Amino acid sequence: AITSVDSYLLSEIKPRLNTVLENCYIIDEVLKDFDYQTRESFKEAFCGKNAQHEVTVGFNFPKFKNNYEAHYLIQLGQGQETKNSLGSIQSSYFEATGDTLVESSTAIREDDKLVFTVSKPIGELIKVEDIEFAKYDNLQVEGNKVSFKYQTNEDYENYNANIIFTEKKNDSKGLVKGFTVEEQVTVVGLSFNVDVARCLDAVLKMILISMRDSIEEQQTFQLQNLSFGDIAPIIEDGDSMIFGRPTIIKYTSSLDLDYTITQDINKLTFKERKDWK
């Protein structure tokens, strides 16, 4: 697909940041190496459900004033294409496949089959969690349902699973044409308190490590690489300075389009014609 690393990072960082900040012992583990008073002050101010201060995330160049006490500024950077395929053919498909998804589901009995229902039509099934079927189990997929023979499996009549699968758009042939790009995004934790900037740096590094395992950047946005700048005053001529430490996140990812092929051939036919010269 076409991709937007900045919007991915914003969408991914915001919930993760919230879920760490609402959970005190996580911060208590992340900041174990800092000075005791720095740790306790940060945990008192920003952390837990009762926290009176709050962190914020957003892109650069807003028209309004931000929460300069603690704010992650996201800032789309450079990139370059790095590796190309022969013919620019990144892949080919017989059935137009969408995004990868993971969904929780439960088995149910139906007509002496077990079935799992999924919210969308299954274009491909990658894994039913914790199950490997035998041929006897007569595994079949149909529409948005996975179906599974009941006879030997009655104990599992309410078994709970996670389905990893991917959508289908439509039944069509084509070529995925495109290339790989290596692209940079900068993130900086602004604070007018230097110890807050240092803690926001630690929290961001933890978040990015945790992010490396996510499906989003396992399937796309691969090879996350981190670089770190000096701590410096971002703005120097207010009633106080504003500090931050930049980090650069670099990703390798595919830019591509679905070139559908309308041509289809369904029968050869043969004829002999005679040359009398």
Partner 1 sequence: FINDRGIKVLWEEAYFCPCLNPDTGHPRVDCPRCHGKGIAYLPPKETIM
95 to each of 100, 175, 257, how far by Cα in Å? 14, 11, 14
Letters for 207-246 (x = contact with partner 1 by CB under 8 A, - = none) are ---------------------------------x------
Q: What is the closest distance, in whole angstroms, from the C-beta atom of residue 190 to partner 1 in the complex? A: 14
Q: Is 150 in the site for partner 1 (CB under 8 A)?
A: no
Closest approach of Cβ 226 to partner 1, in Å? 24
Two tokens at 60? 């650069």
Cα–Cα distance for residue pair 95/93, rounded to 1 Å: 6
Residue 37 or 80 having the CB closest to partner 1: 37
Q: Would you count residue 80 as binding partner 1 (CB under 8 A)?
A: no
**Residue 96 makes contact with partner 1 by CB under 8 A:** no
Rule CB under 8 A: say whether 196 interacts with partner 1: yes
Q: Please answer whether residues 77 and 248 qualify as being in contact, where contact means their C-beta atoms are separated by less than 8 angstroms.
A: yes
Touching partner 1, residues 13-52 (CB under 8 A): 35, 37-38, 41-42, 44-45
Q: Does 194 participate in binding partner 1 (rule CB under 8 A)?
A: yes
Which range binds partner 1 by CB under 8 A, 123-131, 188-196, 214-222, 256-264? 188-196
Taking a C-beta distance cutoff of 8 angstroms, is the pair 21, 13 a contact? no
> Which spans of this chain sit near partner 1 (rule: CB under 8 A)?
35, 37-38, 41-42, 44-45, 53, 69, 192-196, 240
